[PDB]
Amino acid sequence: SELLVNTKSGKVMGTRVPVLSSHISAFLGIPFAEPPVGNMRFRRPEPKKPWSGVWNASTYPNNCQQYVDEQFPGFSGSEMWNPNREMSEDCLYLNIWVPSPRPKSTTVMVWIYGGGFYSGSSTLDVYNGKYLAYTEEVVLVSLSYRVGAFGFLALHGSQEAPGNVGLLDQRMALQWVHDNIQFFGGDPKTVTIFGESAGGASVGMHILSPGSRDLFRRAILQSGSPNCPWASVSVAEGRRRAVELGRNLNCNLNSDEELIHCLREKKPQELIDVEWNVLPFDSIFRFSFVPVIDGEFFPTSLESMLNSGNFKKTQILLGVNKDEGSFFLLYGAPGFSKDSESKISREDFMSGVKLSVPHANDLGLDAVTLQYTDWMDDNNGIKNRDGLDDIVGDHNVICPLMHFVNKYTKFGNGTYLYFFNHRASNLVWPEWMGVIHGYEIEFVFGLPLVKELNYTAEEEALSRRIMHYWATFAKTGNPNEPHSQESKWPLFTTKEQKFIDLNTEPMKVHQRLRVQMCVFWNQFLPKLLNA
Amino acid sequence: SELLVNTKSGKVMGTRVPVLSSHISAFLGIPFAEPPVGNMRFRRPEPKKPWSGVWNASTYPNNCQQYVDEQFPGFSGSEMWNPNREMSEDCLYLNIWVPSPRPKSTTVMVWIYGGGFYSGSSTLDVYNGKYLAYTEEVVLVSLSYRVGAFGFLALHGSQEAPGNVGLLDQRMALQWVHDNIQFFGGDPKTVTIFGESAGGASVGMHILSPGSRDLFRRAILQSGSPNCPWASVSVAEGRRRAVELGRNLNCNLNSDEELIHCLREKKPQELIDVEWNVLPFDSIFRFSFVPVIDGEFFPTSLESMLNSGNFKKTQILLGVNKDEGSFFLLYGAPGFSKDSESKISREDFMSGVKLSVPHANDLGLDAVTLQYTDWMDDNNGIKNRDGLDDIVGDHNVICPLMHFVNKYTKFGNGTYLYFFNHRASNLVWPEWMGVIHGYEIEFVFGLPLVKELNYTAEEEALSRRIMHYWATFAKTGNPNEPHSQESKWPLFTTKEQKFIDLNTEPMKVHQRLRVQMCVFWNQFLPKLLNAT
Numbered sequence A: 001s002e003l004l005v006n007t008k009s010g011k012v013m014g015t016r017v018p019v020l021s022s023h024i025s026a027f028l029g030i031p032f033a034e035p036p037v038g039n040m041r042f043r044r045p046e047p048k049k050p051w052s053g054v055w056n057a058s059t060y061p062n063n064c065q066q067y068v069d070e071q072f073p074g075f076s077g078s079e080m081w082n083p084n085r086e087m088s089e090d091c092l093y094l095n096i097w098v099p100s101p102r103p104k105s106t107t108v109m110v111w112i113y114g115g116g117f118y119s120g121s122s123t124l125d126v127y128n129g130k131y132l133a134y135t136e137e138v139v140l141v142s143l144s145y146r147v148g149a150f151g152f153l154a155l156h157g158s159q160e161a162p163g164n165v166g167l168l169d170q171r172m173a174l175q176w177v178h179d180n181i182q183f184f185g186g187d188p189k190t191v192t193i194f195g196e197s198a199g200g201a202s203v204g205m206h207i208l209s210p211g212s213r214d215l216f217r218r219a220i221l222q223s224g225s226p227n228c229p230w231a232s233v234s235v236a237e238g239r240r241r242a243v244e245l246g247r248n249l250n251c252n253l254n255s256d257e258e259l260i261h262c263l264r265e266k267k268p269q270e271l272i273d274v275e276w277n278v279l280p281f282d283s284i285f286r287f288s289f290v291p292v293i294d295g296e297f298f299p300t301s302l303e304s305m306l307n308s309g310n311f312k313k314t315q316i317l318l319g320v321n322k323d324e325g326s327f328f329l330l331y332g333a334p335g336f337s338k339d340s341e342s343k344i345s346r347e348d349f350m351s352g353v354k355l356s357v358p359h360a361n362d363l364g365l366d367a368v369t370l371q372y373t374d375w376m377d378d379n380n381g382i383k384n385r386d387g388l389d390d391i392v393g394d395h396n397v398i399c400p401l402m403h404f405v406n407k408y409t410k411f412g413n414g415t416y417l418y419f420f421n422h423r424a425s426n427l428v429w430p431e432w433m434g435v436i437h438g439y440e441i442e443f444v445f446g447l448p449l450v451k452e453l454n455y456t457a458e459e460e461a462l463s464r465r466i467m468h469y470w471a472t473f474a475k476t477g478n479p480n481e482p483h484s485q486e487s488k489w490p491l492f493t494t495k496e497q498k499f500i501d502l503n504t505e506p507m508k509v510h511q512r513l514r515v516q517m518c519v520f521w522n523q524f525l526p527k528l529l530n531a
Numbered sequence B: 001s002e003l004l005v006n007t008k009s010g011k012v013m014g015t016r017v018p019v020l021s022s023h024i025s026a027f028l029g030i031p032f033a034e035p036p037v038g039n040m041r042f043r044r045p046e047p048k049k050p051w052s053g054v055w056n057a058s059t060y061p062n063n064c065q066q067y068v069d070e071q072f073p074g075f076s077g078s079e080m081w082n083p084n085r086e087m088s089e090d091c092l093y094l095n096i097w098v099p100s101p102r103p104k105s106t107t108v109m110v111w112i113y114g115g116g117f118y119s120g121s122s123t124l125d126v127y128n129g130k131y132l133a134y135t136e137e138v139v140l141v142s143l144s145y146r147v148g149a150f151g152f153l154a155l156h157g158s159q160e161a162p163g164n165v166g167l168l169d170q171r172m173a174l175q176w177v178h179d180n181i182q183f184f185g186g187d188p189k190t191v192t193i194f195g196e197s198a199g200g201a202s203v204g205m206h207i208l209s210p211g212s213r214d215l216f217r218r219a220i221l222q223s224g225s226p227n228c229p230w231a232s233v234s235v236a237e238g239r240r241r242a243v244e245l246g247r248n249l250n251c252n253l254n255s256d257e258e259l260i261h262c263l264r265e266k267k268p269q270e271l272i273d274v275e276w277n278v279l280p281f282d283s284i285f286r287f288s289f290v291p292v293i294d295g296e297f298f299p300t301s302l303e304s305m306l307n308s309g310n311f312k313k314t315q316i317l318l319g320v321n322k323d324e325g326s327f328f329l330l331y332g333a334p335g336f337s338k339d340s341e342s343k344i345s346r347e348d349f350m351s352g353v354k355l356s357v358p359h360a361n362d363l364g365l366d367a368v369t370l371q372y373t374d375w376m377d378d379n380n381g382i383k384n385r386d387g388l389d390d391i392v393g394d395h396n397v398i399c400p401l402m403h404f405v406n407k408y409t410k411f412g413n414g415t416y417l418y419f420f421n422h423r424a425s426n427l428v429w430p431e432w433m434g435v436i437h438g439y440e441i442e443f444v445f446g447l448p449l450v451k452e453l454n455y456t457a458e459e460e461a462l463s464r465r466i467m468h469y470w471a472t473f474a475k476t477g478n479p480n481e482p483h484s485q486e487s488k489w490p491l492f493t494t495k496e497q498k499f500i501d502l503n504t505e506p507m508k509v510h511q512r513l514r515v516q517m518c519v520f521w522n523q524f525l526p527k528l529l530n531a532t
């Protein structure tokens, strides 16, 4: 009854799950797409054909085919992001958590996972939607989408591998929510899409894309924005990487049809094993198969759309973490280690700069170095380490997001900006990594409310505060409850540019988030590189 | 007898002058070259022909012909730099202060005035050598040299106006000191040349020039160095400016001989009246007629000479002041005023940046702006004013000097670096201008020892400290006295790069003077401009 829901494509049977001292309904693994397998690899998604009988939605679905991180075998800090279910190309499913008893027509939040567009799963423990749905009385959906070559191989002009199909997977899931969430007690007119990293870039890409705009009400972007340097490629570069993928597999490269035909005959792991080989440069924070600026999903360049106001005008809430870059340095840059303080020599700093800004000429590398080097103390290994951490985070996350924030706010209907800088008491990563990319997610999803995870009481309060900001924003377009006597999170405005710190201390309001470095990344360095 | 000295070109009679309750000998206005007048305008100097009888050396000579600053009529802060004697092209003279009684063979210090190579006088009150000569028992010489077009009009390939003749004037006075200072009790083997701004650049240029190197022992450079961006031009640019000077005066421009003949017919003020018109850019801290890189006084580019060690290897003492730029902004940049705090709007900041780095493209100007702008607080008029002050001082004085310091120290025999950051208690310029270009000179010359000038007792002690550093360095190559228990001024070395603050507080040693901004000015911005 409560668990048996008839959708437009057939009946589904959810499950009653415990949450804290109560219970909630979960509908796990609902298909929203035809399985993109066989001759439909690389193709746009097709709607899921109606089924007879009752879909058993009591268990999580398969995860999409992806690179699996084996750098630290058995280590929870890295394993927590790996697929926890079987990988399969048959992976286009979504999950729903519904308060019990079922609400009449409540706010909906739709989670879009990140993972550099090459990885990610809806089923991670850290994305368990039951705490947020229960605590804030929202209907919480997590979608899935094809990643890597399966989702973003781009041979522009081909209709068999057009590019951006992972973004179309997300859109088809949003269309499914639009058409079906009313049957689960959700209001399809009050859908907030939120996501982190590539998920936050994705959220911003749906804000830009005309074909997505009417499928949600407002948006939350965590540590990602659509203009991030890693988040898209040109049609020429997407084609070059697709052709190089075929070259790495001894494919016929004479035509798109023959290349695509060759690639469709490979096992999924064969593509994944050579995926990283197509990158143009040795780099960190760069990924092989990402959205393409195609003239269709994106009618024109992202910058021209931002400048002209060609995007959905609504409310957004968005922000960044203090140390976005540290995870990427640990994995890709010389001198960094999980098991040491990672003091960086001058020589390893220069190597990291080159890896961090791979597209830059020597003049640009000199500019980055001068901007982030204390020449009174240039052999200070801690300063070199933290400077490289800042370079990676500023270039790849913070300054792109600040560019987006400032462009969006000129036309939008309300911007709320945060700076998350709380290091969790129970972090398994070393202290030098600081406030890591993605480590606000466990607060957004309410993991500190679980006693067994051993967060502090102040971290539980911070989680409840963040969940309530997010859900109140989703419900109203404003994270603040007016008439309350809590500290108010102010609107980000073009003039005053206010943001808040998110941490366990009383709220602080600041202005012009990392303005000095972002003038460098957003105005001066592009001019230098263009010259 | 003590005042009656026979030199190689004739007898000179000095005068006994009072100094701080005592007396000293002064020989004022001794000629060291033939008057460079008439057909000798623009020509290399010629040695003074011997004279019969006794040259009256009791009064200061004429000053060389120059632009006179009338921005603030009657204001001592500007008038103290203007000529205080009649101007004449007949101006190649030197002055000598000799301790009394005359020493046997003591250290010589030869002052070379600054003034952007367009102005300056040996006779200014602030260059009065009697306090330094008396207090430190040195023979103090101040030379003179042609400035402006008269000293630096350059038509390379012409022997009638070859360029650099003002530098050759300085060299001829150094040659005169070499040949004659022994008759005044000075040791020609222990001559220190020192100078400020263009004078400091000049000192550095004699360090570089093979034809000057044997005419002095060691060198002091104050707020100037030979590689300063204002201190030299190429032969093509010198020729362009000389032709444009002729154009401004309706001269025949068909040949060097015709142009030079035209320019020699003009009265001196006619040249001066159009001198500034030949500059290629609206700018501050740029001067029309300056040394030329000619292949003769300078055998190759300054940078190649510095890189190869093709220069005099000796000891140097040098440094800069905290606020080198402020004087030049007051005179040339929008928003600045002697009578206000000169808070600078963002618009006037951007105008000032353009004036301060005239050779920069738009990307270069963006780079400078970004380096000196606090984008958390970009409408702060004090920060904008102080940022422009730093830009002008860093680009034109501090960072060129640090480039020289580092290149010289690789091959030299001892470097001592200072940072003068004391603002005089009786300064007549407003507070925003800070520790102004040239305002260490009064301490070097011992003016705080004169009670009527109303320096504090701490400033008198600072002046005595500085004079003793300067003269002890001149005597020994080391500003520190041996066996003394005062704090030691360390050698500047390539690795440690130590310098001292010069002020009324106990000496503090620091490292890497202005290192962050000078990486920008000395490495990044030149690379950017070269690449774009």
Ligand SMILES: C[n+]1c2c(c(N)c3ccc(Cl)cc31)CCCC2
Binding pocket: A069, A077, A078, A079, A081, A113, A114, A115, A116, A120, A196, A197, A198, A327, A436, A437, A438, A439
């Ligand atoms: C794969 N991964 C890792 C770390 C993260 N913080 C992540 C944050 C967001 C996302 Cl989407 C993926 C993340 C830490 C290091 C282990 C790998």
Ligand SMILES: C[n+]1c2c(c(N)c3ccc(Cl)cc31)CCCC2
Binding pocket: A276, A277, A279, A283, A284, A331, A332
């Ligand atoms: C396996 N791999 C990875 C990353 C890379 N940048 C790579 C570049 C070249 C090659 Cl061959 C393999 C690469 C980023 C971190 C994820 C793994």
Ligand SMILES: C[n+]1c2c(c(N)c3ccc(Cl)cc31)CCCC2
Binding pocket: A071, A282, A283, A331, A332
């Ligand atoms: C081959 N490789 C590379 C990079 C990585 N981060 C990698 C991470 C994991 C693994 Cl398994 C392989 C990796 C950085 C770019 C250089 C190659």
Ligand SMILES: C[n+]1c2c(c(N)c3ccc(Cl)cc31)CCCC2
Binding pocket: B069, B077, B078, B079, B081, B113, B114, B115, B116, B120, B196, B197, B198, B327, B436, B437, B438, B439
């Ligand atoms: C002409 N002049 C002036 C000021 C200075 N500090 C100077 C320092 C050195 C030299 Cl050479 C010339 C100087 C202050 C402003 C008045 C003009």
Ligand SMILES: C[n+]1c2c(c(N)c3ccc(Cl)cc31)CCCC2
Binding pocket: B276, B277, B279, B283, B284, B331, B332
């Ligand atoms: C009198 N004058 C002029 C110009 C200048 N750049 C000057 C720079 C500094 C000083 Cl002190 C005086 C200057 C150009 C235009 C002609 C007049």
Ligand SMILES: C[n+]1c2c(c(N)c3ccc(Cl)cc31)CCCC2
Binding pocket: B071, B282, B283, B331, B332
């Ligand atoms: C920079 N500047 C100055 C003075 C002038 N008379 C000028 C006349 C024209 C032009 Cl373009 C620039 C000028 C007087 C001395 C202060 C600087």
Ligand SMILES: CC(=O)N[C@@H]1[C@@H](O)[C@H](O)[C@@H](CO)O[C@H]1O
Binding pocket: A037, A038, A039, A040, A260, A261, A264, A265
């Ligand atoms: C294993 C597999 O899927 N093979 C098919 C192949 O039979 C077909 O001819 C080709 C056309 O695109 O598409 C491939 O996907």
Ligand SMILES: *[C@@H]1O[C@H](CO)[C@@H](O)[C@H](O)[C@H]1NC(C)=O
Binding pocket: A056, A057, A058, A059
């Ligand atoms: C649905 O799947 C769950 C998990 O395996 C199982 O417990 C339940 O009995 C299934 N429902 C059916 C078969 O009707």
Ligand SMILES: *[C@@H]1O[C@H](CO)[C@@H](O)[C@H](O)[C@H]1NC(C)=O
Binding pocket: A412, A413, A414, A415, A491
């Ligand atoms: C949002 O739009 C409404 C309706 O036009 C307007 O009244 C309101 O001022 C806007 N708010 C912001 C923050 O732009």
Ligand SMILES: *[C@@H]1O[C@H](CO)[C@@H](O)[C@H](O)[C@H]1NC(C)=O
Binding pocket: A452, A453, A454
């Ligand atoms: C949480 O802390 C308690 C003691 O404070 C400890 O016994 C327990 O093992 C911790 N939990 C985990 C998962 O380690």
Ligand SMILES: *[C@@H]1O[C@H](CO)[C@@H](O)[C@H](O)[C@H]1NC(C)=O
Binding pocket: B056, B058, B059
């Ligand atoms: C030298 O000149 C001064 C003033 O010009 C004069 O008083 C003095 O008598 C002169 N000496 C002579 C003429 O021997």
Ligand SMILES: *[C@@H]1O[C@H](CO)[C@@H](O)[C@H](O)[C@H]1NC(C)=O
Binding pocket: B412, B413, B414, B415, B491
């Ligand atoms: C100066 O030269 C002497 C003699 O060659 C040498 O012994 C001494 O080390 C040098 N001093 C410096 C500071 O270079």
Ligand SMILES: *[C@@H]1O[C@H](CO)[C@@H](O)[C@H](O)[C@H]1NC(C)=O
Binding pocket: B452, B453, B454
């Ligand atoms: C110096 O101080 C004395 C004593 O007060 C005063 O008479 C004199 O006018 C001052 N000098 C100047 C130039 O102000």
Ligand SMILES: [Cl-]
Binding pocket: A504, A505, A506, A507
């Ligand atoms: Cl709080």
Ligand SMILES: [Cl-]
Binding pocket: B264, B265, B266, B267, B268
């Ligand atoms: Cl004449």
Ligand SMILES: [Cl-]
Binding pocket: B409, B410, B492, B493, B494, B495
């Ligand atoms: Cl050394």
